[PDB]
């Protein structure tokens, strides 16, 4: 049975190791990557190409592993991007900023690199795509991990009076956070602390410097009561827990970010029943027939919450993108791609906006989803495998 | 590469034959079906069960084929329904009406059965689910086929002045129709003729008796100019070109129908650029910012066209269903099903409405798509394989 509809298929996950990765597999992978890279240069360099092939082979045998040239890493992070079946923004693949923190060693050094990142990328609202590569997995017992699903994310508490406050999606991580000594500010929009694990050590908590988390206060351009819902969201979508695989190497810590596509905050974060779940309150406050589904009131509401989100980001000068423009963009990417290298790994179930499905062009496009390399994999949640001091 | 996003995968098609189907494969399939059937009876009948198993085996060997008991066919049509990965209405699976036309022989006899069907099912607007099984494929050279994609469908012409009028989706079938002697009425909503092929003979055309095609005139409940768009649609969704496979047997002709889910006419038929494509005219006539995609005007328009469609069907007393109710319905079906037999072949890419994606519950449900039996397959278009007199 085609399992296309599963969220975290094993095929897409790259789990924990206990010992270096077998040279039998590591070597041919590395040769593959090096060929990819030199092969990418318009105008080749066989001298250099051959030299590198050799150098790497040596190192791998003299050390059972190898290190990438900063140039090769910059090429790895983008290709990995380029090969992300579930991203609509890939038309921007070649435009990434890479922060090489491969020489990091402590958690506080991590906490600093992440801050340099959050700051570089936010740019006072003019968002820039960036990535921060930490030390590559070596023996699997010294892995660098970020226990957060994403850099800036809001906490989710379970109130005394039984009601859940904040983002229910993070109720569990939040407890853990609290278990590790974080002071719960019991809000609806409390930015979660960075929980960092460096060189295999138990995880360490760090509050994100408030000045660094840019936020957008939600207000609709016709409805004055929109603002009364006292809603807001962070401007930076930064995925924090994925693994970068390139030429046999695995970087278990490599936060990356882009800008937002409105429907994420719009439809998913706010409207999902298992998230901020604000669809009824917005329905009611619109006078809609909130008690008859056939009235299509949800379709009606959600579009306004979407206009609010977009309106707010534009008004505040924060970068954002609507799903339509996103889709036409991806469509053009896909064509560049088929022309450029005849193919584009694409996952329709993800590439199609969560609203306005068929009004969007990607809905009518047949796609082939396949995992290439380099690639960004998922990982088992650390607290599930981590061995404590 | 998972090819989940392809429309007509071979896996889902059951093509033409040239000779009976090999007893080696036909027999074990038949035994499987018979066991399924007797196995379905609450309170068994092993006597009968065993007797049938034997009877069928005989027949198959004495004739290289076999015939189903009307009871078995009634069970085949529903199970096939029950096992239609791409249908949201399966909660209604056990409620089908079966018209046994297995003794048909001529095209005019077909044209009559179809009319009995179109009439039984329309019911003056109170739609009833029904199916009409024609003679099963025998040697593959005497197949009964309906060349239409669906019973009632509108024609699509290519105007002199270069412009395409009617439903562009059927421009090709329409030509053929014309090539076979049909008189083009050059309208925007001209019901296409039934093109029937019986017992392997060349296809024959028949106009559907106008009194039989119930139609719904489109009018919005706030916008008076909606009616000025002079739009309408047929009330009966009847798939005409699929193959029913049961216990090794193949019925290449078996039209079936249900009622409509608003978004089909609403979003797909009217809004798809390659269909009636009315999204801009509705945008403009709403004063929306039809020239800035970020204005979300399409999301805005399409929801009104959807309210129009639903409003019209209710006002005219024709059966229809909105996508939300459809989705909650399918969700309940799925659970009955997992409880009833632990599984439900479901194709997410199809089961999710073309609008309001994530606002719908099926969007958040993981599904496993697999082909069971009995099943309704697709077929190669007749005019592509048919051998002419």
């Amino acid at each position: 049975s085609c399992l296309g509809s599963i969220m975290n298929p094993k095929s897409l996950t790259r789990g924990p190791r206990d010992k270096p990765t077998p040279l039998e597999e590591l070597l041919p992978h590395a040769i593959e990557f090096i060929n990819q890279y030199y092969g990418s240069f318009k105008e080749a360099k066989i001298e250099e190409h051959l030299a590198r092939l050799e150098a790497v082979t040596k190192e791998i045998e003299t050390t059972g592993t190898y290190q990438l040239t900063l140039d090769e890493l910059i090429f790895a992070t983008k290709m990995a991007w380029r090969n992300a079946p579930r991203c609509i923004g890939r038309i921007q693949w070649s435009n990434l900023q890479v922060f090489d923190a491969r020489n990091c060693s402590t958690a506080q050094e991590m906490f600093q690199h992440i801050c340099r990142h959050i700051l570089y990328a936010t740019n006072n609202g003019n968002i820039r795509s960036a990535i921060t590569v930490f030390p590559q997995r070596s023996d699997g017992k010294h892995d660098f991990r970020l226990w957060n699903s994403q850099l800036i994310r809001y906490a989710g508490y379970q109130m005394p009076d039984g009601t859940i406050r904040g983002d229910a999606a993070t109720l569990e991580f939040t407890q853990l956070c609290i278990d590790l000594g974080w002071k719960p500010r019991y809000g609806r929009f409390d930015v979660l602390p960075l929980v960092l694990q460096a060189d295999g050590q138990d995880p360490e908590v760090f509050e994100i410097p408030p000045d660094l988390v840019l936020e957008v206060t939600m207000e609709h351009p016709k409805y004055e009561w929109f603002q009364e819902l006292g809603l807001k969201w962070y401007a930076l979508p930064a995925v924090a827990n994925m693994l970068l695989e390139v030429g046999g190497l695995e970087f278990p810590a490599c936060p990356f970010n882009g800008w937002y596509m409105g429907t994420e905050i719009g439809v998913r974060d706010f409207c999902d029943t298992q998230r901020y779940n604000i669809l009824e309150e917005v329905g009611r406050r619109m006078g809609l027939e909130t008690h008859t589904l056939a009235s299509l009131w949800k379709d009606r509401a959600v579009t306004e919450i979407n206009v609010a989100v977009l309106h707010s980001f534009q008004k505040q000068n924060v970068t954002i993108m609507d799903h339509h423009t996103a889709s036409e963009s991806f469509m053009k990417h896909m064509q560049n791609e088929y022309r450029a290298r005849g193919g584009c790994p694409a996952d329709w179930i993800w590439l199609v906006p969560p609203v306005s499905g068929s009004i969007t062009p990607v809905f009518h496009q047949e796609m082939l989803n396949y995992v290439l390399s380099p690639f960004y994999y998922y990982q088992i949640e650390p607290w599930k495998t981590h061995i404590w001091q | 590469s998972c090819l989940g996003s392809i429309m007509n995968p071979k896996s889902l098609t059951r093509g033409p034959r040239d000779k009976p189907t090999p007893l080696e494969e036909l027999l074990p399939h038949a035994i499987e079906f018979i066991n399924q059937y007797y196995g379905s009876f609450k309170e068994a009948k092993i006597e009968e069960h065993l007797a049938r198993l034997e009877a069928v085996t005989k027949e198959i060997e004495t004739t290289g084929t076999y015939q189903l008991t009307l009871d078995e066919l009634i069970f085949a049509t529903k199970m096939a329904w029950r096992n239609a990965p791409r249908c949201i209405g399966r909660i209604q699976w056990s409620n089908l009406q079966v018209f046994d036309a297995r003794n048909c022989s001529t095209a005019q006899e077909m044209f009559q059965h179809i009319c009995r069907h179109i009439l039984y099912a329309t019911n003056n607007g109170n739609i009833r689910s029904a199916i009409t099984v024609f003679p099963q494929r025998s040697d593959g050279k005497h197949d009964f086929r309906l060349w239409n994609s669906q019973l009632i469908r509108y024609a699509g012409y290519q105007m002199p002045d270069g412009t395409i009028r009617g439903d562009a989706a059927t421009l090709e079938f329409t030509q053929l129709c014309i090539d076979l002697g049909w008189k083009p009425r050059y309208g925007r909503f001209d019901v296409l003729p039934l093109v029937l092929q019986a017992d392997g003979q060349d296809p024959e055309v028949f106009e559907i008796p106008p009194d039989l095609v119930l139609e719904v005139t489109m009018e919005h409940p706030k916008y008076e100019w909606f009616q000025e768009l002079g739009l309408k649609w047929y009330a009966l969704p009847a798939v005409a070109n699929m193959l029913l496979e049961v216990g090794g047997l193949e019925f290449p002709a078996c039209p079936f129908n249900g009622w409509y889910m608003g978004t089909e006419i609403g979003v797909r038929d009217f809004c798809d650029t390659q269909r009636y494509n009315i999204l801009e005219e509705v945008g403009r006539r709403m004063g929306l910012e039809t020239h800035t995609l970020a204005s979300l005007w399409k999301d805005r328009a399409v929801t009104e066209i959807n309210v129009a469609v639903l409003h019209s069907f209710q006002k005219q007393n024709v059966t229809i269903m909105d996508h939300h109710t459809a989705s909650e319905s399918f969700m309940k079906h799925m659970q009955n099903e997992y409880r009833a037999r632990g599984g439900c072949p479901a194709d997410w890419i199809w089961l999710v409405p073309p609008v309001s994606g994530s606002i719908t519950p099926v969007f958040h449900q993981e599904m496993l798509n697999y082909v069971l039996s009995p099943f309704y397959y697709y077929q190669i278009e007749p005019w592509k394989t048919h051998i002419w007199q």
Binding site: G342, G343, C344, P345, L368, Y370, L372 | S1, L3
Partner: peptide, 24 residues
Amino acid sequence: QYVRIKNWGSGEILHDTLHHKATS
């Protein structure tokens, strides 16, 4: 070979050859 991929909106088709480089 290559997989024929089609766009039902524009009738356009593309031939995917890159999948060959798929990992297992």
